[PDB]
Amino acid sequence: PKKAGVLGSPIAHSRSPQLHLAAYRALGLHDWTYERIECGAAELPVVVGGFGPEWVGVSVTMPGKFAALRFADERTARADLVGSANTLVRTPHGWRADNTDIDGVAGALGAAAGHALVLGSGGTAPAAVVGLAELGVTDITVVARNSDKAARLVDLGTRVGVATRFCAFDSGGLADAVAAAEVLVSTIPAEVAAGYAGTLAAIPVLLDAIYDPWPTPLAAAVGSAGGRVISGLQMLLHQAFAQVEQFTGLPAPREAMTCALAALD
Ligand SMILES: O=C(O)C1=C[C@@H](O)[C@H](O)[C@H](O)C1
Ligand SMILES: [Br-]
Ligand SMILES: [Br-]
Numbered sequence: 001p002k003k004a005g006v007l008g009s010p011i012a013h014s015r016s017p018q019l020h021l022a023a024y025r026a027l028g029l030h031d032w033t034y035e036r037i038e039c040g041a042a043e044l045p046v047v048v049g050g051f052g053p054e055w056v057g058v059s060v061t062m063p064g065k066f067a068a069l070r071f072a073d074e075r076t077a078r079a080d081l082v083g084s085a086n087t088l089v090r091t092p093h094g095w096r097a098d099n100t101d102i103d104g105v106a107g108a109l110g111a112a113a114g115h116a117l118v119l120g121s122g123g124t125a126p127a128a129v130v131g132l133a134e135l136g137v138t139d140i141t142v143v144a145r146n147s148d149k150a151a152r153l154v155d156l157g158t159r160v161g162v163a164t165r166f167c168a169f170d171s172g173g174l175a176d177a178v179a180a181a182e183v184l185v186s187t188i189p190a191e192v193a194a195g196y197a198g199t200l201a202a203i204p205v206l207l208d209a210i211y212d213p214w215p216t217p218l219a220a221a222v223g224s225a226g227g228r229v230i231s232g233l234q235m236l237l238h239q240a241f242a243q244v245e246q247f248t249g250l251p252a253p254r255e256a257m258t259c260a261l262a263a264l265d
């Protein structure tokens with residue numbers, strides 16, 4: 001009888017429990033639980049540090065992904081590369097940080113090979129950079145409000161072998177950045193992306209990390225313009241597979257989890 005869950009703020013909207021509980025039932029782990037825990041970045045170490053021995057792991061969403069990486073005493077190679085963690089896994093003497101959002105991006109997109117755009121510089125942004133690199137994109141433009149954090153994302157991109165550069169939202173380069181790009185991964189709030197949706201609408205493929213509320217203004221714009229829209233639910237599914245594997249020690253029951261995603265509203 002084990003416990004897991006998802007930590008973040010806000011957290012009430014999370015559809016992680018639906019996916020994990022479906023997986024645990026498919027795996028015959030019928031008494032396992034998975035709950036939502038309201039938790040900011042500052043609070044994460046005290047929340048996780050308070051868990052009893054039946055906790056096997058927690059998923060971590062905004063705003064705790066940087067805090068999660070720091071909290072863990074061991075980190076996977078990919079967490080160490082990305083610089084944030086959306087997964088903490090209990091070990092015999094502590095916790096290990098992993099990042100499965102890379103899988104989320106790569107799995108949701110399926111393929112990508114040309115110029116890409118990433119919006120944002122939060123905890124999911126470096127996973128988008130690495131996931132795009134894994135797919136084989138030739139170059140990435142990072143568009144964010146925080147230029148110092150964007151510089152760190154440029155270094156990351158460069159270190160994984162991808163030509164990366166920064167473009168400010170407001171100074172006049174966004175339109176040209178969009179024109180060159182074949183895929184856009186958005187990690188910014190829907191309320192921020194809304195004001196640029198007309199400029200961004202021309203992108204051929206959009207992966208939006210947001211899934212609630214849905215559709216985002218950005219997704220409506222791209223969809224209307226003829227572009228392919230991939231919702232945050234697809235990213236959620238694909239990142240969830242590796243989380244279930246680390247929490248359970250068993251292969252992810254992909255069929256069952258895909259059916260659970262289809263059973264959501
Ligand atoms: O439940 C959720 O909404 C999420 C779980 C995290 O593991 C994912 O990485 C993502 O940030 C969202
Ligand atoms: Br416990
Ligand atoms: Br272990």
Ligand SMILES: [Br-]
Pocket residue numbers: 061062063064065066122123124
């Ligand atoms: Br975050």
Ligand SMILES: [Br-]
Pocket residue numbers: 172173174175176199
């Ligand atoms: Br522009």
Ligand SMILES: [Br-]
Pocket residue numbers: 189192
């Ligand atoms: Br904001």
Ligand SMILES: [Br-]
Pocket residue numbers: 231233234
């Ligand atoms: Br969907």
